Structures are given as structure tokens and as C-alpha cells.
Symmetry: C2
Subunit: 372 residues, 2 copies
């Protein structure tokens, strides 16, 4: 069976996890601190905070910017539900903007006009674009637009650790940036995430919120404010630390698999039967999602692929189609691209233990299905 | 060095964690489901949900009962900050009631009069007592009082998995019960927690909130509501599953260490120099906390113990002393017992790898310090 995802925990990491469990040094320790340092250096960013999961990173980002009831945050239509959900878990309203058919990322023009026509009643406080599947495209434009309208930028870089927007690493352009280490993401810690920022106050506040308002004082730990628990275990941090130095190389290889997919599938694209993703420079290829033409029923294609020993799945959700984000601004609107990607987007296997021969099998199976 | 805490991960668990990491089956899986079943059977309760940490269990309990802005929840003065913090993270107000000097648990009489004199403006919705250090005492009274005033009961049983109130397991009397698997708690998963309930709607709602509103529908996963991510990893669940069948036996042994402490220290108690905890039937002895007489400066005692090769620490915090929970009801009040325990409570080593000879050393060192 060719799998969509096959999480890769280096044997070194496995042995280190065993040492930690045996010695009983379990809670956020030197291991988390080191991971944070190592992430910050990898990204070229001032501060990193590792946390329970990528949702927790987005949540702490929101809480650190004091976003909640009476506020609004713009999210993309195409993403995982967590993006829009976590905004509304704070009491703010998720304001949906459609994505671009080429990049699967928030459409920068539709973003700008959404801000221009914003009529309240909530105060628009932030933009939360997704660098979907590892695609950096649009990030500098989001920064530009955010600054123009005096809004915070929160990068939902869940899928995009090690993605690069030209000269600048994804996650380091927003006021804060958020990563997931969920098993389908390329670096995993089972569950895990990271919140990053070049801003000291945002860092210090999120750090308080991550662990019950705790900080080191003159005579030990002081409780400075109300907070949560979104700490990551020491042994989860160790897993992360062992993968990070391999991550760039993993991404290079994934870009090579993408090339092989592009090779095999370009005729089908040219025949108007599918659309391929544009793997720009700096795309980390967390997911390789094609778009089936309307002619094809994705559920049937998936079943046929499965019979031929190939896993596949939808890429992400349409936030408008979920019917959970009920601000007037969303219901009065018609989304085009996200709902389309939701129904016809197809993720194909792409990971660390896929080779040319596998991709060839995948591509031949898809071809026969689509040309029947 | 005699340590306060020495987390015990069975070698079986270590090998199983290694198998899970190597096979790449990481996200909440059969392992979490099995742990939940095994917890529910251990407790004699209908539903269990494992989660990121004990704070997350309290949070989901609050959110499932729809407690937030405009609401109030009664918490004990003596506890870990998370108890009161997580109430206020929902927008509700933490209303503090003092504890009993004998049990370190919410004083049931002061609880009743706090309800009787409650004058708003918020709606009192719940009581969140702590079964502090594994002490079940008071639990049936909390249930009685909650029912009398039509309030929800949320047991903060962070420290009390395997504690028993007569015939009934701690955690199973509240509308919901919450456990921590933090490293200092007897069963640890590094970080981890569990939310339990005999109520189906509370269970189903918390289960939605734990993972982005997700549920199994006709054609796979449906997104029914807004939620969070408080999932526990599969490999953390495995650790838990390996410890649970040993837990009763661990508790029996801790009660034996308590006996040895009581033996050695009763003269000092009788001389009015310390007060010992009452280890009632069903006390799980997560912590063995004595109270120093006012004569003694706990910081100095701790330093002296440390020089003599013995770790020790404060037991918990006073929520009133933190000055974070600013409802009128709390500031207009004077707390007696919690602030005292906060300043003079001293936790002594008690865990799975402490023996009679260690306790003897601890007790002799403490004696010499206190009798100087
Ligand atoms: Na060990
Ligand atoms: Na619509
Ligand atoms: Na492996
Ligand atoms: Na006071």
C-alpha cells in the first residue's frame, strides 16, 4: 500500500526518547529550550516557543495580541478548520476571504477589497493567511496589506516549516508565525507546534499564557497573570530536535518527487483533465494537491486509487461550506475557489519514503482512471 | 539526593513507545481509545476522554457546561493556580472559598455560606473543589451542596486518580471529573490529563471541543462545531496504559510510606512543632504535606534539608495571595487557612522509589532542624 503519510522518527530520536523516559526528566526542560533556540536559528527569528500543537500556537498568538470578543480576523476559505475555529474560540469573528486557484492561498486582491468594504460592527484586528501545503506565495503581499491597514499579521504556517519566501523564512514575516508538528506535517512530534516572533512583548506574553502565567522571579517561580497549559513534553521536543537538521534535505527531496509528478502528469494537465500545483521557489511541499476537472468524482477516483494500492485524500476544507462561521460578511458572500478545491482537490502521496517507482505507479494508475 | 519526585515509566511502556515511534502511528489512535476504556473501567464511570494535560480537562469541562462570561465558579483558596486561572480563561469569575486545616480541601461550611450570601452580578454556575494531594474528604458533601443549589460540580481531581471516597472513585461524583498526568502526579504521561463523566451530552460535547468539532459521519469525518486541539498522542497514551494496572499498588505503597512518616513525626506533632496530614481511607497520597508551626521559616528549613541531601517544596498556592482573581467577593474577604498553608506547608519526598531508610533519614534531618 502506498501511503499518503509515513512519519519519520530518526532512530537517534527514538533512543533519546527512551533515555528521557527512563531517567524521568519529562516536563518542558532543557530539551524544549534547546529546540526553541534551534528553531529560532533555523528560521532567523528572535523568539520561538514550542507548544502542544499548531492550534495552540494560533491560539496563543491571538491571545497575545488581545484578540477576542468584539474583534474580527480574516482567514482563508481553503484551510483546515482549526484556522477559523481558533479565531472564534476567542470570541472574535472569522471573516473569510477566498483563495487563488494557482497557489491555494488567500487571494491578496480579494483580501484588500474585503478590508476596504469592512463595515463592522467588530473591529478588524488581524489577517491570518495560511501558507497552505508549504506554499509561501503571497506572504510579502499579506505583510504589505496588513501594514497599510494597521492590522496584525498572524502567519498560519502550520504546514510550512522550512518554506521560504525569497530571502525570508516563512513564519518570520508576520507579527507572529505558527507551525504544526502534527504527524502529516514534515517535522512531527506526534502532536506539537511552535509560535515565533521578532517582538519581545508578544513573545513574553505568549510565554506566560503557555504555562499558567509562570515566570522566574527573585525567589523562584512567580504567577504574573492568568494562563493556560500548552506546554510540550521534553521527549516530544527531542524528537523535533533530531528532525530539524534533516528538514531542509527532506524538503529538497520532496521537491524532487514533485518534479517527478510534474513530469508524468503534465500531459493530463495539458489535456484539461487536472490542474497541477505550482511548486514555486521555497515551497516546502508538505502536500502535493492536484485539482480534478469537474468531470471527475473525487470519491470514485479515490476508491479506484485505493483498489490499485494508492492512498489519497482531500487537501483541505472550505470554511464557508462548513457553515460554522456565520458573520454577515461570510453568508452574504459567494466563494468560488475554496469550495471548488474542497470538492475536487486531491492529495497524492509525497513523503520521505516514496521513490520514483512509487510515483510512476501512482501516476499510471491515476492516468488509467482519468482516461477511462 | 533524595528527590520529591522520580517519574516511573515501566520498561514495557518504554519499548511500546519505541514501537509506536518506529511504525509511525502517532496521532490519537487505538491507544488513546483503549486508555479511555481502561480508565473508565478503573473508575467505574461511563465516559473517559484523554487530553493534553489536566488544565485542558478542566477547560473542556467548563466549555462543555457552557461556563464563560457572566458566570461564576467557586474554587478553593489552596490549590495550583490552574484551578482558578482556567475558570477566568473562559471569561467567568473565580470565586474563592477557604480550605479546611485538616484536609487541605475546600471547607464545606464556608462553601455553603458563600453560596447563601452570593449577590451576583454573575450567575453562579458551578463548584470546582480540589481533591488536594489525593485527599477525597469532602467530596460527597460537595455533591450534596451542589445539588441543593442546582449547581454543576466539576471535580479538580488533578492529583487524585485512584483516590476513593468510601465506595466511590474520586472523579466520578462530579458532573465531570478531571485528572492530571503531569510528572509529579503518580501516573504520568509527561503531560496528559483525562476528563470523565457519566453524562452523555457532556462527554459528546467535550469530545467535539477536544478536536476541532470533529466526528465520524456517514461519509467520514464531519465538522459539527467550533473546537480546539487538546488531543493526547498515541505514545503518551501507551505510557498511561502501562501504569494504570500498577496504580492501585503504587498507592498502597505510598500509604505505607505515609505510615512511616506518621510513626517518626508524631512526637514532633505532639510537641506542637508541625501538623501532619490526615491520610484518611482512600487518600492516594500524591503529596505528603506537613504544616510547619509559625516559629519556622520554611525557606530556611528547605535549605537545611537540601544541605542534608533531601528535596522538599511548598505544597500549593493561595489563590487569594496571588492577587489575580479580583471579583469583589474575593477582595472583600479574609482567607485564613489557604494563606497559612501557602507559607508553611512543606511537601516531603514520597514516591515509588523511596524506602524506609530514606524516610528515616528525612525524618531525622527534619527533627534536628526543628529542635535546634
Ligand atoms: Na525509570
Ligand atoms: Na455563500
Ligand atoms: Na521509522
Ligand atoms: Na484578603
Amino acid at each position: 500500500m502506498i501511503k499518503l503519510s509515513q512519519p519519520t522518527i530518526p532512530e537517534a530520536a527514538i533512543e533519546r526518547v527512551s533515555e528521557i523516559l527512563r531517567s524521568g526528566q519529562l516536563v518542558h526542560g532543557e530539551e524544549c529550550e534547546s529546540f526553541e533556540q534551534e528553531l529560532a536559528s533555523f528560521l532567523g527569528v528572535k523568539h520561538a516557543l514550542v507548544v502542544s500543537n499548531g492550534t495552540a500556537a494560533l491560539h496563543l498568538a491571538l491571545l497575545a495580541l488581545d484578540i477576542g470578543v468584539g474583534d474580527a480576523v480574516i482567514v482563508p476559505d481553503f484551510t483546515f478548520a482549526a484556522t477559523a475555529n481558533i479565531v472564534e474560540m476567542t470570541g472574535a469573528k472569522a471573516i473569510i476571504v477566498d483563495v487563488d486557484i494557482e497557489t491555494y492561498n488567500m487571494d491578496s486582491e480579494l483580501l484588500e477589497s474585503c478590508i476596504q468594504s469592512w463595515s463592522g460592527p467588530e473591529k478588524l484586528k488581524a489577517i491570518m493567511p495560511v501558507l497552505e501545503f508549504g506554499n509561501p506565495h503571497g506572504l510579502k503581499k499579506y505583510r504589505e496589506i496588513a501594514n497599510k491597514y494597521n492590522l496584525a499579521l498572524i502567519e498560519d504556517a502550520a504546514c510550512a516549516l522550512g518554506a521560504k519566501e525569497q530571502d525570508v523564512m516563512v513564519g518570520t514575516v508576520g507579527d507572529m508565525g505558527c507551525f504544526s508538528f502534527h504527524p502529516r506535517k514534515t517535522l512531527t512530534t506526534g502532536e506539537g507546534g511552535a509560535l515565533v516572533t521578532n517582538n519581545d512583548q508578544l513573545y513574553e506574553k505568549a510565554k506566560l499564557l503557555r504555562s499558567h502565567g509562570m515566570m522566574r522571579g527573585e525567589f523562584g517561580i512567580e504567577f504574573r497573570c492568568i494562563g493556560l497549559n500548552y506546554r510540550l513534553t521534553n521527549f516530544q521536543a527531542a524528537i523535533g530536535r533530531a528532525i530539524l537538521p534533516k528538514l531542509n534535505g527532506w524538503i529538497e527531496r520532496r521537491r524532487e518527487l514533485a518534479t517527478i509528478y510534474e513530469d508524468a502528469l503534465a500531459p493530463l494537465e495539458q489535456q484539461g483533465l487536472i490542474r497541477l500545483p505550482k511548486i514555486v521557489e521555497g515551497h516546502s511541499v508538505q502536500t502535493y494537491m492536484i485539482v480534478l476537472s469537474d468531470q471527475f468524482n473525487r470519491t470514485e477516483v479515490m476508491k479506484a486509487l485505493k483498489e490499485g494500492g494508492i492512498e489519497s485524500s482531500l487537501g483541505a476544507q472550505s470554511m464557508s461550506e462548513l457553515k460554522l462561521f456565520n458573520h454577515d460578511s461570510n453568508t452574504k458572500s459567494n466563494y468560488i475557489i475554496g469550495p471548488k478545491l474542497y470538492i475536487y482537490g486531491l492529495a497524492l502521496p509525497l513523503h520521505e519514503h516514496l521513490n520514483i517507482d512509487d510515483v510512476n505507479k501512482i501516476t499510471e494508475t491515476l492516468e488509467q482512471i482519468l482516461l477511462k
